[PDB]
Design a protein around this ligand. Structure first.
Ligand SMILES: CCCCCCCCCCCCCCCCCC(=O)OC[C@H](CO[C@@H]1O[C@H](CO[C@H]2O[C@H](CO)[C@H](O)[C@H](O)[C@H]2O)[C@H](O)[C@H](O)[C@H]1O)OC(=O)CCCCCCCCCCCCCCCCC
Ligand code: CLA
Ligand code: CLA
Ligand code: CLA
Ligand code: CLA
Ligand code: CLA
Ligand code: CLA
Ligand code: CLA
Ligand SMILES: CCCCCCCCCCCCCCCCCC(=O)OC[C@H](CO[C@@H]1O[C@H](CO)[C@H](O)[C@H](O)[C@H]1O)OC(=O)CCCCCCCCCCCCCCCCC
Ligand SMILES: CCCCCCCCCCCCO[C@@H]1O[C@H](CO)[C@@H](O[C@H]2O[C@H](CO)[C@@H](O)[C@H](O)[C@H]2O)[C@H](O)[C@H]1O
Ligand code: OEC
Ligand SMILES: [Cl-]
Ligand SMILES: [Fe+2]
Lengths: 50, 137, 447, 335, 340, 82
């Protein structure tokens, strides 16, 4: 059937699932941002800005 | 930026007197220097004894002084050690040993003067390069 | 007669595979070019040759070949008379015209084939007898030649022996080693460090001697082939065709090309450092010599001097205990040479001779060879790749060795190529797989 | 039994073996198994090797502080030079591993086998009724290994100067080479990179041209590869459409239309180029190095006017002046 | 409409196809090649690198080059009519204006050329895999001749157009970036070296697995320019390699795509590696190695050895390779082994 | 297999061509020769003549050290008889 590098072509004309995927992407990018922050706040030292 | 006769004015003898070479002698010397010296004295050094170079100053503190046409010429006929306390014509090319160093057979007093002049003119042009080794290449 | 409906243009000479006559013109015209070169080159060399100056410093490779045979030279390789050089050069140059004549003739006038215009000369590739016989003729011609050398050395003058007792000089060999145990011993010698195989010959007796054996053995086989046919195996083993024979001779030259490369690079005897330059190991040895000599004069005790690594600045030991020169030069402890031998003892370099038996001629020999190592650039600038322009020089040993490795190599390819073609030509598929009967399609699947 | 040996010879030469163990194979298969097994063991557990013969062991194995990129099998000692150093030439293995014994056992067996590998690449071609010469293409990469593992050492007088068996060890071989021979300024090397660059270029050329001019037989959502069946009669691409395109890219007569002339060029170019590169290393093994244009252009007074050729010399001096720190005792590097 | 007539004319099948692309390609492509050939013989690099760089001065085909601008210029585009040259031509030449000329022009010339491929492909109606492939050479030029110097102090550290002038770029990258030890460069060579293998191996495999379609030995004429049967036994080739190497192709469509992939992927990786060298984010050292080498003076790998070679390269080259820094390294500070 | 252009082969063979190019080709040649031999090229490209790299005594290089005042700085370099 579809080669591994083409599995996402399954959306080329399915506006619904195209929005559904992309929504997931944004979720991950938003998710990463939030949690990458927490990682820095858990390790950043404000004791000296100089 | 040229080889003016001003640059070709090198000390003839110990008593300050000088001689002025010509672009013909220079080139000729340079050619002869390659023919019988370059082999071991390429670029003013000494491959078979790096401690003694052809720097004018080095030749000045030699014994006797070899930093003038007369000096170098004498050397090319009867070579000595840096203190002059020993003749080395047997393991160094020279006129009195042309049988041992064929390259020195052709060489006539005219040729000897050119080679000597070359040795005094090069450092004038190249400067530090002439004396030093790979460091200055 | 022959055109595109034979072979392609760029494969033209293969259209002569079955035209004995014309194929003779080629070989006779070709053999002219070699004579032409040898001659025309010798005169070119001599035309530039400067007597009072080393041969290796003048880009000569033929005049030193003549010098070795004891011609125009004397004490220490001193050039006495340039006439033998001029002679050998002009003679060849002439014979090139003679050969060249025949070549051109046989290739554009004479019979295009030989078989009919004389059945003696005409031949058949598959004629196992004609082949073994012509081969037999040549095996004799080459055999006489091998003796032509033995004659020049023993009767007509001698050869240049660098090992000469009184110091390098033309010497008449009148005692050729004929002892087979010794002669053929060389062939059983290792080709690695130390035991050097053929390249390890170090005296003219063996050289002259060995050549006597070859001269005979060769003509012997020359007669044998005239009077015989290949046996059974000899026939069921080889391929009998015009190409196959070529190939066999191609791989043969290749192999000889490699052996020649190492001979001119390593051997001191049949390639005198007096005419050619100092050998690779010889020059590196000379540096050690030079500086051990220098510093020793400055009051340094060479025997106990300790270098940076704690190995021995000037002198150290080889893996088998012998005293050798120190430094990177430890790799060349297998070097032997006239100038250096008088310092060697029964255990290698003797600390006593080194301490007070060093002679001036050795000091300047070492200096000479040190400042004339076989290092140079394509554009002929002697020294290390970082050197400055001034000394225009590249050791003849370097030129010879490289040229002949390239040739030797390409010939081994030539071999493979013509041998691969011959095997396919024979069996008959050197032009493609039979569309119909495709061999592979009849074999079970390995999958 | 039709005759044991007769059978033996029929099996060996058999074209029905999964892997064609040939006659050359009979020498190949054992030599290559020795080389690989010794290598793998060396590279992982071998102890330090005094490569420069100056009692200054260089460890190049994993278990002794190395990683894949740095680790290597170190060349035999310089004290050994070109001498043959088989295990039975050492008082013990301990001595053999210290003098870089493994190196020789590997290079000799490999070079031997890799040659028979070529000999085999002929044999099978013979037994299958196909034209030879494939083995002649493989003669280029082999002739390099030879040049780098045997020719250069013979020329230089020692096996310690052969290319090491490792990543970083190879970079060492290169950097030093350049310093002592100025290879970048040598015709043979340039032809080599021409062949290699060109190769990759043409490899991309053909590759693209062909794949781009494939006859359609596949769906819009089906691998374009399936449009080919192993054992086809006709071609799988429009070599006339390919030439049509490429002929317009440059100009008609500067384009191939003959698949046979195309593929010959495709093979000839790299092989010929690499042949020269191998002859480069094999030529510079006798100190006939690259062009030396140091202090060529000088002005009217005699001053030295530098060129890029000079800037290269400085970089070279740095390598020269710094390689093999403690190995030199004298002025000129003649070894 | 004139447009369609302009089109009509351009897309006309001539000897040397012009096309819309040509309006960009030919002007640049010619100026780039022209500028090089000009500088190569006439312009100097004295005021820029203190180097003779043209035939007119005595340089030969190897030592000639169009050297980069001074380090003072910075990343200046160096326009003929810009603040530097100020409309003057001779000055422009002496300030290495010809570099950004060749660079920027040739850059667009490579855009045009790929566009051409794209345009000609479309017309001839073939797939654009010749265009995809050509992305690799673009990436290289862009990253090395533009992106790289854009990360450094100036154009001065970009590779100068010339034979020898490129060899120092190599040596520099070794000495300063230890480029050979970079994972991306390695992939690079793996692609080019391995790509030059596929080229050779496939070519030979075909020429020696051919069917006989003629009665001559020179089988070149024996080829059908008009398709039909496979000109070589794909079935025999498979069996050959399947027995000599253990692995073998069996899908010309894949075998040919692979040949596109390998060298194009290779060149792309080598590019990334350089894009990082712009920020000097190199793959210079292995920390675990250095720490042990510090504490333990007897630990020596072929890696440590190399780093010393770099030190020498940097110390002995930097003076005349970076004039604007007015370097002065006393003989005593110059790192050197024994005797040499 | 063809386009409008007149087959090179024919042209490179037409006596007319040579009657034209025997004049044209050498013309361009002698021109370029003169371009160099008259010293014009040196001025068109600011390329130093063998006697114009350094001043007699100076051994320093005329390195352009600042972008904006470069042209001016270059002119001054020609001043010291460089
Ligand atoms: C695919 C493409 C494949 C291409 C393959 C090419 C292979 C070429 C190899 C050359 C063949 C060697 C034959 C030979 O002339 O062999 C001779 C050479 C040279 O041997 C030399 O032999 C001796 C030379 O002595 C001579 O030289 C002087 C020392 O420098 C002394 O003065 C001395 O008196 C003088 O006799 C020394 O021991 C040298 O150190 C050196 O070992 O062998 C060697 O180096 C070769 C080392 C062994 C490997 C060969 C295996 C062949 C199968
Ligand atoms: C490769 C060497 C060679 C060979 C094999 C031949 C062979 C042949 N040539 Mg020939 N030829 C050669 C070189 C050679 N030629 C050269 C160099 C020339 C130019 C001078 C000619 C000029 C030539 C002509 C003009 C003619 C031939 C002809 C012929 C054919 C008739 C045979 C014949 O001439 O008998 C000749 C008689 C002999 C057997 C006596 C030769 C003895 C000589 C004088 C001594 C040679 C000494 C030798 C160099 C040293 C070997 C001795 C050593 C073993 C100790 C024959 C096929 C003829 C032909 O075309 O007919 C079909 C013919 O007309 N040749
Ligand atoms: C703008 C973002 C973007 C988007 C939306 C797409 C979308 C698409 N691309 Mg694509 N592509 C992009 C950028 C993008 N590409 C870039 C920058 C490149 C050059 C590197 C490519 C190169 C490319 C190729 C060569 C191909 C596609 C194909 C496709 C289509 C099929 C996708 C597929 O099934 O993958 C399958 C995906 C996986 C199963 C493998 C992913 C493995 C990756 C490489 C590992 C890395 C994962 C990691 C999380 C990525 C981090 C994201 C990073 C950017 C921050 C799809 C429409 C294919 C198509 O045309 O089919 C006919 C196709 O062949 N693309
Ligand atoms: C509710 C809306 C919202 C808000 C207020 C923010 C706010 C913020 N986000 Mg954020 N974010 C959101 C949604 C939002 N996000 C979503 C939905 C996602 C998932 C996709 C993310 C993913 C995300 C990440 C991954 C990160 C942030 C970060 C940040 C902070 C840094 C802001 C920054 O510099 O932006 C930069 C803004 C740009 C990238 C400029 C966009 C302009 C583009 C280039 C033009 C687009 C072309 C345009 C169409 C042309 C037409 C224009 C026309 C007028 C000409 C900031 C607090 C960063 C942070 O520090 O971590 C917490 C960070 O790393 N966000
Ligand atoms: C070693 C060099 C060499 C030699 C000796 C030959 C020899 C020969 N080739 Mg040949 N060939 C060579 C190189 C050589 N080739 C190369 C490099 C190529 C590739 C370009 C070819 C391609 C080639 C083809 C395609 C063909 C031959 C053919 C032939 C044969 C017929 C000669 C001929 O056609 O006369 C033609 C006569 C002339 C046009 C006159 C040529 C002028 C003469 C021969 C030279 C005179 C030499 C000198 C100046 C005068 C000396 C006189 C003095 C002694 C007094 C002949 C045996 C043909 C063949 O197969 O045989 C039937 C043939 O078809 N060759
Ligand atoms: C092969 C044996 C050989 C050897 C070892 C030498 C050696 C030497 N020759 Mg020499 N020579 C030879 C054959 C040989 N020659 C031949 C056959 C001729 C006739 C043309 C000459 C003509 C000749 C002359 C006229 C002179 C010399 C000189 C010299 C000396 C100086 C070397 C020189 O400067 O090289 C420099 C040469 C090169 C750097 C050129 C390299 C060429 C290579 C082989 C090209 C390889 C490219 C390849 C074939 C392309 C094919 C690929 C393609 C098919 C795809 C040197 C001792 C000179 C001398 O004696 O002065 C002291 C001198 O003036 N030779
Ligand atoms: C160079 C000229 C020459 C040529 C071309 C030939 C050619 C031939 N001779 Mg021969 N022969 C020659 C000179 C020559 N001979 C001389 C001078 C003599 C006198 C000693 C003989 C004596 C002779 C005899 C007595 C016989 C032949 C036979 C044959 C034929 C088969 C040989 C064979 O099968 O070898 C292949 C041999 C092998 C299967 C053994 C290979 C093992 C080799 C020898 C050792 C490994 C080689 C190694 C790589 C080299 C390293 C050097 C080594 C010393 C360490 C063949 C046509 C035979 C024949 O058919 O007669 C008509 C035969 O019986 N010859
Ligand atoms: C069409 C192909 C082409 C292209 C793309 C370029 C591109 C370029 N050339 Mg160029 N060049 C070409 C052909 C081309 N050239 C030809 C045929 C010649 C020989 C005559 C030259 C000769 C040449 C020289 C001598 C130089 C360049 C340079 C340059 C570069 C900078 C020039 C620039 O700033 O442009 C500016 C871009 C424009 C003028 C485009 C404007 C288009 C708009 C739509 C028109 C609007 C006009 C209107 C009046 C504006 C109203 C606004 C109002 C507020 C005033 C640039 C990369 C310079 C360079 O290399 O520096 C390093 C340089 O010195 N070129
Ligand atoms: C003597 C024997 C010597 C042993 C050789 C070992 C070969 C390695 C085989 C690797 C697997 C190949 C594979 O999976 O592809 C198997 C395939 C063959 O299978 C393919 O199947 C189909 C593809 O859709 C097509 O039909 C193709 O035509 C082909 O048949 O090979 C290829 O197509 C790719 C060619 C390149 C192969 C890789 C070269 C090996 C390089 C190894 C380097 C790594 C070394 C690491 C060191 C630590
Ligand atoms: C697509 C874009 C292509 C652009 C190509 C522009 C090429 C011409 O570029 C133009 O060259 C002339 C010199 O010939 C310069 O002209 C400059 O030198 C002349 C003297 O020769 C001065 O009088 C003028 O004040 C000065 O600006 C212009 O400043 C420059 O803009
Ligand atoms: Mn490794 Ca060739 Mn460096 Mn001198 Mn040893
Ligand atoms: Cl090192
Ligand atoms: Fe193909």
């Amino acid at each position: 059937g579809l080669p591994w590098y083409r599995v996402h072509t399954v959306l080329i004309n399915d506006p619904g699932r195209l929005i559904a995927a992309h929504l997931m992407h944004t979720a991950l990018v938003a998710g990463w941002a939030g949690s990458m922050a927490l990682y820095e706040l858990a390790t950043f030292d404000p004791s000296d800005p100089v | 930026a040229e080889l003016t006769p001003e640059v070709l004015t090198v000390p003839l003898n110990s008593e300050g007197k000088t001689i002025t070479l010509t672009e013909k002698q220079y080139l000729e010397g340079k050619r002869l220097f390659q023919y019988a010296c370059a082999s071991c004295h390429v670029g003013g050094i000494t491959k078979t004894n790096p401690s003694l170079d052809l720097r004018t100053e080095t030749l000045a503190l030699a014994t006797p002084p070899r930093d003038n046409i007369e000096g170098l010429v004498d050397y090319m006929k009867n070579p000595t050690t840096y203190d002059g306390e020993q003749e080395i014509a047997e393991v160094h090319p020279s006129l009195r040993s042309a049988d041992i160093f064929p390259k020195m057979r052709n060489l006539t007093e005219k040729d000897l003067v050119a080679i000597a002049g070359h040795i005094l003119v090069e450092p004038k042009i190249l400067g530090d390069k002439w004396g030093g080794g790979k460091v200055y290449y | 007669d022959q055109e595109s409906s034979g072979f392609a243009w760029w494969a033209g000479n293969a259209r002569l595979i079955n035209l004995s006559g014309k194929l003779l013109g080629a070989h006779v015209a070709h053999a002219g070019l070699i004579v032409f070169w040898a001659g025309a080159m010798t005169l070119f060399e001599l035309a530039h040759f400067i007597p009072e100056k080393p041969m290796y410093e003048q880009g000569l490779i033929l005049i030193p070949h003549i010098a070795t045979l004891g011609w125009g030279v004397g004490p220490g390789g001193e050039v006495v008379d340039t006439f033998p050089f001029f002679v050998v050069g002009v003679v060849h140059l002439i014979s090139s015209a003679v050969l060249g004549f025949g070549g051109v003739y046989h290739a554009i006038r004479g019979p295009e084939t030989l078989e009919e215009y004389s059945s003696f000369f005409g031949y058949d590739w598959k004629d196992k007898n004609k082949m073994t016989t012509i081969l037999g003729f040549h095996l004799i011609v080459l055999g006489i030649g091998a003796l032509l050398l033995v004659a020049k050395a023993m009767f007509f003058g001698g050869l240049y022996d660098t090992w000469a007792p009184g110091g390098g000089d033309v010497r008449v060999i009148t005692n050729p080693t004929l002892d087979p145990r010794v002669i053929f011993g060389y062939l059983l010698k290792s080709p690695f460090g130390g035991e050097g195989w053929i390249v390890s010959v170090n005296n003219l007796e063996d050289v002259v001697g060995g050549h006597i054996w070859i001269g005979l053995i060769c003509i012997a086989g020359g007669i044998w082939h005239i009077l015989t046919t290949p046996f059974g195996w000899a026939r069921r083993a080889f391929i009998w065709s015009g190409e196959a024979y070529l190939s066999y001779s191609l791989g043969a030259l290749s192999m000889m090309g490699f052996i020649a490369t190492c001979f001119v690079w390593f051997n001191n005897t049949v390639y005198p450092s007096e005419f050619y330059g100092p050998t690779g190991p010889e020059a590196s040895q000379a540096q050690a010599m030079t500086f051990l000599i220098r510093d020793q004069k400055l009051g340094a005790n060479v025997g106990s001097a300790q270098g940076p690594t704690g190995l021995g600045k000037y002198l150290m030991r080889s893996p088998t205990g012998e005293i050798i020169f120190g430094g990177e030069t430890m790799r060349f402890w297998d070097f032997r040479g006239p100038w250096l031998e008088p310092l060697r003892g029964p255990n290698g370099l003797d600390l006593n001779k080194i301490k007070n038996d060093i002679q001036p001629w050795q000091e300047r020999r070492a200096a000479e060879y040190m400042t004339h190592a076989p290092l140079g650039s394509l554009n002929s600038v002697g020294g290390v790749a970082t050197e400055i322009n001034s000394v225009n020089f590249v050791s003849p040993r370097s030129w010879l060795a490289t040229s002949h490795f390239v040739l030797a190599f390409f010939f081994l390819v030539g071999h493979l190529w013509h041998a691969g073609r011959a095997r396919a030509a024979a069996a008959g598929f050197e032009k493609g797989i039979d569309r119909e009967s495709e061999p592979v399609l009849s074999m079970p699947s390995l999958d | 039994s039709a005759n044991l040996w007769e059978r033996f010879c029929n099996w060996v030469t058999s074209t029905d073996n999964r892997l064609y163990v040939g006659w050359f194979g009979v020498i190949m298969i054992p030599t290559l198994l020795a080389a690989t097994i010794c290598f793998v063991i060396a590279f992982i557990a071998a102890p330090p090797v005094d490569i420069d013969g100056i009692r200054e062991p260089v460890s190049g194995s994993l278990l002794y502080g190395n990683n894949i990129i740095t680790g290597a099998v170190v060349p035999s000692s310089n004290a050994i030079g070109l001498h043959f150093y088989p295990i039975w030439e050492a008082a013990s293995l301990d001595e053999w591993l210290y003098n870089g014994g493994p190196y020789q056992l590997i290079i000799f067996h490999f070079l031997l086998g890799a040659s028979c590998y070529m000999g085999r690449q002929w044999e099978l071609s013979y037994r299958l009724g196909m034209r030879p010469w494939i083995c002649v293409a493989y003669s280029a990469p082999l002739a390099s290994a030879f040049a780098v593992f045997l020719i250069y050492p013979i020329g230089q007088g020692s096996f310690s100067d052969g290319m090491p068996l490792g990543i970083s060890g190879t970079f060492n071989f290169m950097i030093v080479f350049q310093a002592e021979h100025n290879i970048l300024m040598h015709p043979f090397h340039q032809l080599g990179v021409a062949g290699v660059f060109g190769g990759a270029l043409f490899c991309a050329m053909h590759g693209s041209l062909v794949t781009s001019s494939l006859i359609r037989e596949t769906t819009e959502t089906e691998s374009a590869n399936y449009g080919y069946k192993f054992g086809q009669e006709e071609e799988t691409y429009n070599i006339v459409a390919a030439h049509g395109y490429f002929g317009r890219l440059i100009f008609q007569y500067a384009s191939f239309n003959n698949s046979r002339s195309l593929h010959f060029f495709l093979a000839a170019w790299p092989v010929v180029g690499v042949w020269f590169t191998a002859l480069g290393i094999s030529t510079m093994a006798f100190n006939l190095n690259g062009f030396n244009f140091n202090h060529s252009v000088i002005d009217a007074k005699g001053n030295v006017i530098n060129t890029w050729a000079d800037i290269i010399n400085r970089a070279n001096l740095g390598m020269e002046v710094m390689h093999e720190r403690n190995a030199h005792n004298f002025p000129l590097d003649l070894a | 409409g004139w447009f369609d007539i302009l089109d009509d004319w351009l897309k006309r099948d001539r000897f040397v196809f012009v096309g819309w692309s040509g309006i960009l390609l030919f002007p640049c492509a010619y100026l780039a090649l022209g500028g090089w050939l000009t500088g190569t013989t006439f312009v100097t690099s004295w005021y820029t690198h203190g180097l003779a760089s043209s035939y007119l001065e005595g340089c030969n085909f190897l030592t000639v080059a169009v050297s980069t601008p001074a380090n003072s210029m910075g990343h200046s585009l160096l326009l003929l009519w810009g603040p530097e040259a100020q409309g003057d031509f001779t000055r422009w030449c002496q300030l290495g204006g010809l570099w950004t000329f060749i660079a920027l022009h040739g850059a667009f010339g490579l855009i045009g050329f790929m566009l051409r491929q794209f345009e000609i492909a479309r017309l001839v109606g073939v797939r654009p895999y010749n265009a995809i492939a050509f992305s690799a050479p673009i990436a290289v030029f862009v990253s090395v001749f533009l992106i790289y110097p854009l990360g450094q102090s100036s154009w001065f550290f970009a590779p100068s157009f010339g034979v020898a002038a490129i060899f120092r770029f190599l040596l520099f990258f070794q000495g300063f970036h230890n480029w050979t030890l970079n994972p991306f460069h390695m992939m690079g060579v793996a692609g080019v070296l391995g790509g030059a293998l596929l080229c050779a191996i496939h070519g030979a495999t075909v020429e020696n697995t051919l069917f006989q379609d003629g009665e001559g030995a020179s089988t070149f004429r024996a080829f059908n320019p008009t398709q039909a049967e496979e000109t070589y036994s794909m079935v025999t080739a498979n069996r050959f390699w399947s027995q000599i190497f253990g692995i073998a192709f069996s899908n010309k469509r894949w075998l040919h795509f692979f040949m596109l992939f390998v060298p194009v992927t290779g060149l792309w990786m080598s590019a990334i590696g350089v894009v990082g060298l712009a920020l000097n984010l190199r793959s210079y050292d292995f920390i675990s190695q250095e720490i042990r080498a510090a504490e333990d003076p007897e630990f020596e790998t072929f890696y440590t050895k190399n780093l010393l070679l770099n030190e020498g390269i940097r110390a002995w080259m930097a003076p005349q390779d970076q004039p604007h820094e007015n370097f002065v390294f006393p003989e005593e500070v110059l790192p050197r082994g024994n005797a040499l | 297999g063809t386009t409008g252009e007149r087959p090179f082969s024919d042209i490179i063979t037409s006596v007319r061509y040579w009657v034209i190019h025997s004049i044209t080709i050498p013309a361009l040649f002698i021109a370029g020769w003169l371009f160099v031999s008259t010293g014009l090229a040196y001025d068109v490209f600011g390329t130093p003549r063998p006697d114009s790299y350094y001043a007699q005594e100076q051994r320093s290089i005329p390195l352009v050290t600042d972008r904006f005042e470069a042209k001016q700085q270059v002119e001054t370099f020609l001043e010291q008889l460089k």
